[PDB]
Ligand binder design. Structure first.
Ligand SMILES: NC(=O)c1ccc[n+]([C@@H]2O[C@H](COP(=O)(O)O)[C@@H](O)[C@H]2O)c1
Length: 249
């Protein structure tokens, strides 16, 4: 018979098992979250999207999960990123008092995973899930990341650092989660400065990417929020990582 097919990849195999296992692992090494009930976390995560049409998801659907995974890390230890996360995560493994969203319980639970359900039944769809462009933007995955990315970013203070992909057409992309959500929730009451770290790929010919038109575009957004702006090139990721704990030696 007929089964509905979306354009995007389906739910990651073993998603329920993985999400539960991730919660158990996280709470074991983070004594601050040690007594979070991981079954309740999974129940809330699941309840946000199962039995719902996967284009009828709103931010409120994830509010029960958000409450259970409440975690407000030191606001002055936030690292944001856009497009690429590999270096960001490597950085927080070296500078271990720093956090990306994916180093918090909620980000950790969902990073690299895809998920969606269907109307009326409790079945997880492992065949397909809506594509943000071809099907609908209001899908379980896109809506999840939108709501957690805002919460994480809006709480930030002092200097907020963001890693940007300097190999792309738009080094700063206003249509990314950082550009459309996070940058607009930085509060000048708490945030003194946004500092951009532009990551060079292999084809950037050692040029000063802080002079890029999209960086001026980011600078303008930030200045209009009465926040200071700073930009630095990361020419060599491996050299950058080696110098993290001694940047002025
Ligand atoms: N871990 C993810 O897959 C994921 C997805 C969407 C947004 N985010 C958060 O938003 C930012 C990146 O999103 P963009 O690449 O769309 O700017 C990062 O700060 C990240 O913490 C993460």
């Amino acid at each position: 018979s007929w089964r509905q097919q979306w354009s995007g990849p389906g739910t990651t195999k073993r998603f329920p098992e993985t999400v539960l296992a991730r919660c158990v692992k996280y709470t074991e090494i983070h004594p601050e979250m040690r007594h979070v009930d991981c079954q309740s976390v999974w129940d809330a995560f699941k309840g946000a999207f199962i039995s719902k049409h996967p284009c009828d998801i709103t931010e409120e659907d994830y509010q029960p999960l958000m409450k259970l995974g409440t975690q407000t890390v030191p606001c002055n230890k936030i690292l944001l990123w856009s497009r690429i996360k590999d270096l960001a995560h490597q950085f927080t493994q070296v500078q271990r008092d720093m956090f990306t969203l994916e180093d918090t319980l909620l980000g950790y639970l969902a990073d690299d995973l895809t998920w969606c359900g269907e109307f009326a039944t409790s079945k997880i769809n492992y065949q397909s899930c809506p594509d943000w462009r071809k099907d609908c933007s209001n899908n379980p995955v896109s809506v999840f990341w939108k709501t957690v990315s805002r919460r994480f970013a809006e709480a930030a203070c002092d200097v907020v650092h963001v890693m940007l992909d300097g190999s792309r057409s738009k080094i700063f992309d206003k249509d990314s989660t950082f550009g459309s959500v996070q940058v607009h929730n930085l509060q000048p009451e708490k945030v003194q400065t946004l500092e951009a770290w532009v990551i060079h790929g292999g084809r950037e010919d050692s040029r000063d990417l802080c002079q890029d038109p999209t960086i001026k575009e980011l600078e303008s957004i930030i200045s209009k929020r009465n926040i200071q702006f700073s930009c630095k090139n990361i020419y060599r990721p491996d050299k950058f990582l080696q110098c993290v704990k001694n940047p002025e030696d």
